[PDB]
Amino acid sequence: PVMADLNGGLQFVPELKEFTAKLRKELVETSEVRKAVSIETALEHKVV
Amino acid sequence: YTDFENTFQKTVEPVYQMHIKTSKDIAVLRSKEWFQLDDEDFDLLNKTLTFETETEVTFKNANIFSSVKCF
């Protein structure tokens, strides 16, 4: 019986769960911060 | 009267309270030029900010201010 590993080297990363969580958190925080800043800049521009 | 060049208005705005719950709030505040801090590295997270602003507006016409200052 054979065990083919088609994992793409994903096992070699330390704490893959934490790394993946931090990637998602970084992308999410960037998206929300950019969206909020754009909305507030738009509201300030419209008010002015 | 249409002599808006001689009109001005100084108003003590009501005190405003803002609870900084997340880093999104901090980013929004730092995106504002008017929002300035003596200590730029001040940790605003989990902190309540109170704003006591006064607005001085000089009028260009009935609707549009000729100049707006808020300090």
Add this chain to the structure above:
Amino acid sequence: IPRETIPFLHLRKKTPAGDWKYDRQLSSLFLDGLEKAAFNGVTFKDKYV
């Protein structure tokens, strides 16, 4: 314990690669606990099992 050996009872440690290997430190702690239990006896007061 002899050098470069695996005791019959040991504790393993998970390596960064994700696989469990014999660990001298944890195994020593467990064997020392076993010796204390064998000689002095081990209490389980206030232990709800």
